[PDB]
Design a binder for this molecule. Structure first.
Ligand SMILES: [Fe+3]
Length: 53
């Protein structure tokens, strides 16, 4: 699934992860460390919304 950062528009794609910040591809948003933040703007996880119909 994909989640959008409501502040800056960055999309966290679980298939892509965030390798440069220690997140391997396939890591679910709920599995992200509590201290993980948007890599673009710094926003906490609370500011993300799941993109699901
Ligand atoms: Fe952001």
């Amino acid at each position: 699934a994909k989640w959008v950062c409501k502040i800056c528009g960055y999309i966290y794609d679980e298939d892509a992860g965030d390798p440069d910040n220690g997140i391997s591809p396939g890591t679910k948003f709920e599995e992200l460390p509590d201290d993980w933040v948007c890599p673009i703007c710094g926003a906490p996880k609370s500011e993300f919304e799941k993109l699901e119909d």
